[PDB]
Amino acid sequence: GIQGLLQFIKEASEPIHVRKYKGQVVAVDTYCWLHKGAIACAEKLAKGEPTDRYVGFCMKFVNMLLSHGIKPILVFDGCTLPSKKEVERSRRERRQANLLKGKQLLREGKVSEARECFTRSINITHAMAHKVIKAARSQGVDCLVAPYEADAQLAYLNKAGIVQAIITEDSDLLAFGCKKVILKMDQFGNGLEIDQARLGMCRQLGDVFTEEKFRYMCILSGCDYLSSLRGIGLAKACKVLRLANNPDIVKVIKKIGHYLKMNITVPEDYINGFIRANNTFLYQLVFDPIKRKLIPLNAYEDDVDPETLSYAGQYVDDSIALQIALGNKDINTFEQIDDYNPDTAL
DNA sequence: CGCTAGTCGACAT
DNA sequence: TCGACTAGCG
Ligand SMILES: [Mn+2]
Ligand SMILES: [Mn+2]
Ligand code: NA
Incomplete structure (x- = not known):
């Protein structure tokens, strides 16, 4: 995320309600709903105890979107980008740390601070995300697992014309060149919209x-x-x-x-x-929903050599990319954990 | 004024 | 996880 960006371009922000996107398609950075939903049941999740509160938490957002005549395309994070493995490890260390010291704070009696310890140890796994995927697909809502970061996939979905808006909490979408970005949306549809063309309203932006x-x-x-x-x-x-x-x-x-x-x-x-x-x-690398093929976010320019861009993700077979995008193939073990087929009835 | 690094809350009873 | 918020400092 671009720290301080949202406050830096506040002149281009506008308080809206999602009703203005009725009859149109809106893609969603589902990981924010997943996290905020995991907060409610951070205790059971950190202990490994069975729970599915976050599923309902996401699904009431989804239902809220469906109630206002909006078609949501839930997008999920896929494989970790090679340039962030050290970072993800460094964060995982902090998660496990807050987990253990959280358990010790439970051993010593205080729970209000221990709560704050367990809420920072939340690790959104692909299994949970897949639960949300099934929960949404049981309602006819499309789901697409990004090849890597969901940011770039969302950016593609918006810049291609498949969706007209993107629901998220991360400002990285603005850096990826998104047209319209809906930030800070509650359970009722009250959010904050930022348009790319409206960035001109910011004087200090020049x-x-x-x-x-x-x-x-x-x-x-x-x-x-x-x-x-x-x-x-x-x-x-x-x-x-x-x-x-x-x-x-x-x-x-x-x-x-x-x-x-x-x-x-x-x-x-x-x-x-x-x-x-x-x-x-x-x-x-993102995934084209229409052509079903691994493509870069933007078309390769004539100056850049596409052979030296492995840090932006490497290519695989389009079939494998398809089975990964559908959530049928585990990102880690590369094994078939599901068999969804959108054809026989994005 | 601008920037760094750290804190803190989210959900929800 | 990410932004909002702030004391501390150039
Ligand atoms: Mn992201
Ligand atoms: Mn991001
Ligand atoms: Na900086």
Whole structure:
């Protein structure tokens, strides 16, 4: 997530209700509903005790969407991106830590703080997600498991015209170049909408409303793929991109000390990390629902070599990609754990 | 003013 | 998990 982005472009935000998308299709970052639903039953989940409260929690959101004549496409996270394995491990350590020390806090008597310990140990597994998938598909609601991060898949679904809006809590969608993003939606449909074309309402944003420059801004400020240079936030990065009339971002980053009047040393591997971040935001592998084939988020440009983009995910056979996307194949064991067929009755 | 790093709440009784 | 919020510091 782009920390502070939502407050940085608040002028482009608008309080809405989902009724305005009646008769249209809306994709959903289901992992947020999964997490907020897991919070209610974090105790049983952390203990391994059987529960399915989060299923109902997600399904009342889904039902709420269905009640207003909206077609929801639930999208789920798939395989972990190779550039975040260390990160996921480092987070898993914290989860297990809060789990154990949570159990010890239960041993010592306080539960209100122990609650706060168990709520930070929540690990959304693919099994839970699959439970939600079955629960939704029993209602005729489409479900699609992303090849990797659901962010890029959602971005594709929106930029292709399959859906007209995206329900999420993560601002990464804005960096992926989404047209419309619905944030902070409760059980009743009251949410906050951000339009890409409305980014012009932000005065301090300057002329950084174009998708490319906006992406550059989000990356330079600091994202999940690359940590920002110490002292570089959203405002200063935006200032750099505003003061830079040069289309070549590399020379700009090399002159980031010049555009800001600061003693900023730019390491040579930071440029590599930046290029990788941009290529990940641009060409992360998604799944085409129509053609049923692994494709990059955006079409490969004539300058970039697609052979050196393994950090954006590697390709597999389209059949395997299909069985993975349908949730029929386990992401980890690559074994058939289901046999859904959308044909015999996205 | 801007940025870093840490805290805190979410759900729900 | 992610944003909101804030003390501390350039
Ligand atoms: Mn995500
Ligand atoms: Mn994200
Ligand atoms: Na930053």
